[PDB]
Design goal:
Layout lengths: L14 E8 L2 E8 L9 E8 L7 H16 L8 E5 L6 E5 L6 H6 L19 H20 L12 E3 L5 E3 L11 H5 L5 H16 L11 H9 L12 H10 L10 H14 L4
Antiparallel strand pairs: 1-2, 2-3, 3-5, 4-5, 6-7
Helix pairs in contact: 3-5, 3-8, 5-7
This protein binds ligand TZ0.
């Protein structure tokens, strides 16, 4: 029995459940009067709830996700908590809707069709500057979360969502081996520094327009290969400077990786110098 929290509570009648977005389960919905000072406006939102066949660990995880989202607060580049329906029936956690889906899918749909190398499984191509701008927005979100002492633990382009206005939003930050820092694979030590590693894999995903990391490398081998100083090759269409940044994020010594603060400052600069092509 969840306790009431009138900071977040939305009467269930104010919510109109629409179509599934993916499977907890997430469904599109329309929310009437989220804003106290605009009670006759409807907003599109995503609603996370348990599946039919759920347990009581699945519930306690859903509740802890919600509680962490209330603590972390709002930022443009994270999926923000908007509300909750907790009392009059099954738990609904209401969050921002991102109409263009996850980043992996978004980039894939925008591949040039003629690349035998990486087919388009589906939109307008992304310029060089737009791709860098994507990386910058993800780094800003992660900079905010780290400032709030949140360790993501599964940062990847599949865990970034894209809004109607092409805003990148970190998802699932309040709750796979190919994104994990060596020290996370082995010693299960998760830090802001391991999140930086994951961000490097995510940069690589960006500049390969949603490629699969370590292609053809069996998971079983990966720790050994990384300990021996194996890193992914530069993506064909990536500048040497952005590759340097990737490689820095993949420093073996965690203390030697850049912070999200530095990454944001470096990407801010790169975006401004990046072109038309
Ligand atoms: C990996 C992709 C994936 O699962 N997708 C892509 C579309 C779909 N989806 N999944 C979505 C979600 C979600 C979500 C739900 C949450 O509930 C607590 C928390 C969270 O991160 C803070 C994100 C979502 C959304 N917010 N807006 C639009 N589409 C959404 C499911």
């Amino acid at each position: 029995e969840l306790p009431e929290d009138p900071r977040w509570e939305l009467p269930r009648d104010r919510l109109v459940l629409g179509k599934p977005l993916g499977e907890g389960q997430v469904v599109l919905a329309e929310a009437i009067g989220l804003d106290k000072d605009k009670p006759n406006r409807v907003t599109k939102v995503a609603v996370k709830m348990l599946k039919s066949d759920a347990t009581e660990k699945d519930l306690s995880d859903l509740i802890s996700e919600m509680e962490m989202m209330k603590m972390i607060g709002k930022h443009k580049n994270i999926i923000n908590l908007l509300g909750a329906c907790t009392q009059d029936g099954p738990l609904y956690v209401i969050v921002e809707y991102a109409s263009k889906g996850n980043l992996r899918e978004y980039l894939q749909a925008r591949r040039p069709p003629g690349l035998e190398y990486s087919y388009n499984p589906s939109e307008e191509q992304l310029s060089s500057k737009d791709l860098v701008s994507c990386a910058y927005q993800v780094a800003r979100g992660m900079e905010y979360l780290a400032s709030k002492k949140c360790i993501h633990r599964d940062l990847a382009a599949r865990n970034v969502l894209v809004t109607e206005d092409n805003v990148m939003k970190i998802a699932d930050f309040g709750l796979p081996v190919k994104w994990m820092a060596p020290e996370a694979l082995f010693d299960r030590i998760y830090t802001h520094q391991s999140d930086v590693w994951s961000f490097g894999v995510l940069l690589w995903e960006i500049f390969t327009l949603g490629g699969s990391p370590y292609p053809g490398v069996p998971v079983e081998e990966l720790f050994k290969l990384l300990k021996e100083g194996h890193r992914m090759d530069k993506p064909s269409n990536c500048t040497n400077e952005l590759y340097m940044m990737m490689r820095d994020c993949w420093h073996a010594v965690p203390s030697q990786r850049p912070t999200f603060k530095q990454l944001v400052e470096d990407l801010d600069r790169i975006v401004a110098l990046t072109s038309q092509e």
